[PDB]
Amino acid sequence: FAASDPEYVDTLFREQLLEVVMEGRELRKVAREASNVINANTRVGDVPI
Amino acid sequence: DLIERNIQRVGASLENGINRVFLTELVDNAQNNHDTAGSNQGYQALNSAVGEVDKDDFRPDTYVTHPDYRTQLFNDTNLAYANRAGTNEVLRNREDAPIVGDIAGLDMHAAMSSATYDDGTDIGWSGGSETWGFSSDGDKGAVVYDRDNIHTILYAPNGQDVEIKDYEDPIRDITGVNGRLHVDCQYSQGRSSATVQY
Amino acid sequence: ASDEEFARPTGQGAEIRDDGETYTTVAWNATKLTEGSRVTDEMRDQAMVDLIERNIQRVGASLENGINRVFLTELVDNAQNNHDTAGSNQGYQALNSAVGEVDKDDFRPDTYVTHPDYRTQLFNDTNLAYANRAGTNEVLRNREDAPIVGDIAGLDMHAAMSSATYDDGTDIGWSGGSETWGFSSDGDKGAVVYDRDNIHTILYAPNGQDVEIKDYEDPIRDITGVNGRLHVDCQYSQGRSSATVQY
Amino acid sequence: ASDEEFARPTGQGAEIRDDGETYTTVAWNATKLTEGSRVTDEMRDQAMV
Amino acid sequence: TDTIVNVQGSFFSASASGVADTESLLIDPQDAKFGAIEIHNIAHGGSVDVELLTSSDDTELVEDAAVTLDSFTGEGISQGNQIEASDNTNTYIRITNTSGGAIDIIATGREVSQ
Amino acid sequence: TDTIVNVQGSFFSASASGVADTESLLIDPQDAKFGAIEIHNIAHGGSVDVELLTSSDDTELVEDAAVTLDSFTGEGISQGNQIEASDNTNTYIRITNTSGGAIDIIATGREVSQ
Amino acid sequence: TDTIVNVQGSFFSASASGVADTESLLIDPQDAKFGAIEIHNIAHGGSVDVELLTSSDDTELVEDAAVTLDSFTGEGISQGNQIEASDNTNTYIRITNTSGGAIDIIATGREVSQ
Amino acid sequence: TDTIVNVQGSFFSASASGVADTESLLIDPQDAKFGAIEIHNIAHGGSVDVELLTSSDDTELVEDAAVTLDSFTGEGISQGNQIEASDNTNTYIRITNTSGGAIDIIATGREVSQ
Ligand SMILES: [Mg+2]
Ligand SMILES: [Mg+2]
Ligand SMILES: [Mg+2]
Ligand SMILES: [Mg+2]
Ligand SMILES: [Mg+2]
Ligand SMILES: [Mg+2]
Ligand SMILES: [Mg+2]
Ligand SMILES: [Mg+2]
Ligand SMILES: [Mg+2]
Ligand SMILES: [Mg+2]
Ligand SMILES: [Mg+2]
Ligand SMILES: [Mg+2]
Ligand SMILES: [Mg+2]
Ligand SMILES: [Mg+2]
Ligand SMILES: [Mg+2]
Ligand SMILES: [Mg+2]
Ligand SMILES: [Mg+2]
Ligand SMILES: [Mg+2]
Ligand SMILES: [Mg+2]
Ligand SMILES: [Mg+2]
Numbered sequence A: 001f002a003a004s005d006p007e008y009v010d011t012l013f014r015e016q017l018l019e020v021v022m023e024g025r026e027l028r029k030v031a032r033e034a035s036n037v038i039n040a041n042t043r044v045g046d047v048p049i
Numbered sequence B: 001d002l003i004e005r006n007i008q009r010v011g012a013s014l015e016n017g018i019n020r021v022f023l024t025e026l027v028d029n030a031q032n033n034h035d036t037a038g039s040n041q042g043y044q045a046l047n048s049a050v051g052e053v054d055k056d057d058f059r060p061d062t063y064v065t066h067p068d069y070r071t072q073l074f075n076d077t078n079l080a081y082a083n084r085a086g087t088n089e090v091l092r093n094r095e096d097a098p099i100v101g102d103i104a105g106l107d108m109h110a111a112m113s114s115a116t117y118d119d120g121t122d123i124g125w126s127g128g129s130e131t132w133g134f135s136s137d138g139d140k141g142a143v144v145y146d147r148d149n150i151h152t153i154l155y156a157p158n159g160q161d162v163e164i165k166d167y168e169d170p171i172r173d174i175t176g177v178n179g180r181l182h183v184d185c186q187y188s189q190g191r192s193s194a195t196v197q198y
Numbered sequence C: 001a002s003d004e005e006f007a008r009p010t011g012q013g014a015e016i017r018d019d020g021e022t023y024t025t026v027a028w029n030a031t032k033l034t035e036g037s038r039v040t041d042e043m044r045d046q047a048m049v050d051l052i053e054r055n056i057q058r059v060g061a062s063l064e065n066g067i068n069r070v071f072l073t074e075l076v077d078n079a080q081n082n083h084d085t086a087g088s089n090q091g092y093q094a095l096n097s098a099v100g101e102v103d104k105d106d107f108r109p110d111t112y113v114t115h116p117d118y119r120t121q122l123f124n125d126t127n128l129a130y131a132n133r134a135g136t137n138e139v140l141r142n143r144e145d146a147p148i149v150g151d152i153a154g155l156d157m158h159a160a161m162s163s164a165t166y167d168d169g170t171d172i173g174w175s176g177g178s179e180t181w182g183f184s185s186d187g188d189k190g191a192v193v194y195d196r197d198n199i200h201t202i203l204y205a206p207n208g209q210d211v212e213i214k215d216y217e218d219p220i221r222d223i224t225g226v227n228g229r230l231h232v233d234c235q236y237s238q239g240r241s242s243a244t245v246q247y
Numbered sequence D: 001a002s003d004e005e006f007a008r009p010t011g012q013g014a015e016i017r018d019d020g021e022t023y024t025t026v027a028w029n030a031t032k033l034t035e036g037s038r039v040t041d042e043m044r045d046q047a048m049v
Numbered sequence E, F, G, H: 001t002d003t004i005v006n007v008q009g010s011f012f013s014a015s016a017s018g019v020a021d022t023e024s025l026l027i028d029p030q031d032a033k034f035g036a037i038e039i040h041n042i043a044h045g046g047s048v049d050v051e052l053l054t055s056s057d058d059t060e061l062v063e064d065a066a067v068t069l070d071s072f073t074g075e076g077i078s079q080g081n082q083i084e085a086s087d088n089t090n091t092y093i094r095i096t097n098t099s100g101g102a103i104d105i106i107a108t109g110r111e112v113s114q
Helices: B002-029 B043-055 B067-075 B089-096 C041-046 C051-077 C092-104 C116-124 C138-145 D041-046
Strands: A036-039 B032-035 B062-065 B108-111 B140-145 B150-155 B163-169 B174-180 B182-187 B193-197 C031-040 C081-084 C111-114 C157-160 C188-194 C199-204 C212-218 C223-236 C242-246 D008-010 E002-008 E011-019 E024-027 E035-043 E048-055 E063-072 E083-086 E091-097 E103-113 F004-008 F011-019 F024-027 F035-043 F048-055 F063-072 F083-086 F091-097 F103-113 G002-008 G011-019 G024-027 G035-043 G048-055 G063-072 G083-086 G091-097 G103-113 H002-006 H011-019 H024-027 H035-043 H048-055 H063-072 H083-086 H091-097 H103-113
Touching (some): B002 B140, B002 B163, B002 B174, B002 B182, B032 B043, B043 B193, B067 B089, B067 B140, B067 C092, C031 C041, C041 C051, C041 C223, C051 C188, C051 C223, C081 C092, C092 C188, C092 C242, C111 C116, E002 F103, E011 F083, E035 F083, E048 E083, E048 G103, E063 G103, E083 E091, E083 E103, E083 G011, E083 G035, E083 G103, E091 E103, E103 F048, E103 F063, E103 F083, F011 F024, F011 F035, F048 F083, F083 F103, G011 G024, G011 G035, G048 G083, G063 H011, G083 G091, G083 H035, G091 G103, H011 H024, H048 H083, H083 H091
Parallel strands (some): A036 B150, C081 C242, C111 C157, E002 G002
Antiparallel strands (some): B140 B193, B150 B182, B163 B174, C031 C223, C031 D008, C111 C188, C188 C242, C199 C223, C212 C223, E011 E103, E024 E091, E035 E083, E048 E091, F011 F103, F024 F091, F035 F083, F048 F091, G024 G091, G035 G083, G048 G091, H011 H103, H024 H091, H035 H103, H048 H091
């Protein structure tokens, strides 16, 4: 008709993209606090009972 | 910065991995179980699970909880009614309530996600013996345990923790980011732990 | 960005396999909300109030009501979790269960919007109505102005909404959302529990940032007009961060 | 004054439709409420109140 | 021990005077406060068919399942039944006139929790 | 666990001595504290018709729906009824003498919540 | 003494429309909030066999014990049952069509605590 | 006044598949949380004798009193009974196969307080 934005959305301008990327789901991380953490010297080992 | 973002994803994915190894050991190798059989699933189930560990002469101090179990626990009139709890903190602040980290002689609440347990549905993971959940018969929805009797063992050849490495492929114009950590989880005494079963 | 996943158990010296971030977008397309009013020059003179000022206020208010409609319609329709109360345990337990649904999808809600009927049911709940069970007589005493109503179930904020705000398609020019906003009958959505930071109200104006009010004089008919406009959309970034409560 | 309404979702370049403030009144007609009493001078003197 | 007096749960009734020949009283559990009902009594004024229906719709009757429970003849009362209906399970009880003329139908019972 | 003793809900009765030949006992749930009733027993003293009525009026009986529930002959007790009425649903139970002479009617039951 | 109004425990129903000739409605107490059910009413729409089953599996039906409780013929209602099932005891009720054609089955009752 | 929803007390069941010709399902109220039971339903799969026993021993069955309650023939369900047993009164219910071949027995009811 006249010029309207729906006709020229990709010719006279570009749709705005936000520079913010919105985060996905984050899982709860507790194991380090919720257990005894052993920093091992070897990948295989034993603890005496 | 897609490389920084992928470095963050890689680190997070490894942390999620530690949590999976931990939760899978914790749920599978607990030597005691409280079968709620529907019915008295809130505080009574926690007290009964502490009772199982007490009967094997250990003292639990921590509980790990599924979202469905948390939901049921906060619907328990013993916690939901300020009268019965001695505090309105569960009615108001819910999981952030100081009483939720201080139930049944336990010092710590470890709120966990539904996805963390190894169902064997995730690619490369072989599956634990149980179901992590609290919405169908036989699901394990909480573990009541002694935090000092379960060991998360972390190994790295270089340094102490997650190693992140990067590479350029000049032939293909690709940049790669690789993370690694070695983890195991083991009970010293599996009798120090009780699952709560639906 | 895609959800965080889990590292793979790997053999020694084996190739590290890739599972990078996949990405998507949510689109906004802001709809022009408009409101007009016309007054004759004779009535403008004779009236005791400024009719143009009054109509400017009405136009502004009508646009604000429009923003609230677009927001509530998105919020109710596109929530990815639902707690079906099945006509039972409809007060605090329903809110806790709705928070539980969002928690199960690994998001933390902080806000709830509520229908007047849901508010009424919630304040009849013995957990809130009895000072005993609430730890506080403030709901019995001050109703929605109680601090606990902005503090239940781990939520920081109560956003009390009107019955007319949701798009039923009963209002002129509005096409209707998918749901029913209410708490009277089976399948009514009476509250939404959500993360305030994961739903976006998007406002566009060509000639500024907010409501544009324009006026016109018709010298042929002796009429002064006032027209308001704003373009608005509402979109969830993560619709899993929200749960509806269903009757 | 008439109630607050909602703005109209409108096409680009379309006419803005009117929904102006309609007005009404509530009428008052105040009714004369009256009460009267008469006392004789002798009763006024002789009464203790 | 603690002594409590139990008064029985909410009375429910549906009624229609002058139900025309093939027309019906639709007993809707949406009219209950608790959203479920148990009809004990059908007092029928003339011959009726009693029918239990499931709706496709949460709020309106659009027939999915329909079972004719029983047929009653002449005037009387069927007393002490338990025919049960809820809003959330979209269950309705229809009492249909079969008399050839207008009848009064009164159905009574109790509200039940969903 | 918690033990509670359940005592049963409020007794209700309506009675009339020497009800004349065509006259009636009107059992009105407005007389109940809870405003609804369930009649279990009708001790009839002679022949009676039992009738369930809905009123057009909230407070008085103006007949809308009326169903004659049953007829009893001679003296006796109709034990084990559940005929229900409430004030808010404007429901009344009428027990009409049909004996040809004066009778005593006693109806007993329980109050029900509205 | 304290007075309390007792409303009756949660309504339960299972239903199916157009159940084919040899097919069945499986009433699963896993669908109950309390995880156990008591079916009072079976509105059968045509001929059916009612069957009580125990599963080997906690969550799915794998037949261990199966007893055919009763057979119903034609259309009607079986009223005043107490057939019971729970999730934790892995008990299921199957209502199987035997009509030679499609039927509507509605089963209603009450939820029970485990 | 105060309104409460009453849900019914704990479901109980005992079951056995493939009970051999002269063998039995022993229903032990020690398996109940409350330590007493009321069996409503016996669904029997073939002929059975139902038997009520007292033990001399507080934990195991050593027969003291034993009464054969009833004999059931063929397949079906005895529904809506109240056969009652407790842990502390050393009472047991035995359902014994008499079919000449293997049967499935499912018994359901409710837990009762001691
Ligand atoms: Mg070794
Ligand atoms: Mg042990
Ligand atoms: Mg707070
Ligand atoms: Mg390769
Ligand atoms: Mg992936
Ligand atoms: Mg979800
Ligand atoms: Mg025009
Ligand atoms: Mg208007
Ligand atoms: Mg419905
Ligand atoms: Mg059909
Ligand atoms: Mg529904
Ligand atoms: Mg009335
Ligand atoms: Mg009439
Ligand atoms: Mg009224
Ligand atoms: Mg099960
Ligand atoms: Mg078998
Ligand atoms: Mg189980
Ligand atoms: Mg003997
Ligand atoms: Mg004993
Ligand atoms: Mg003893």
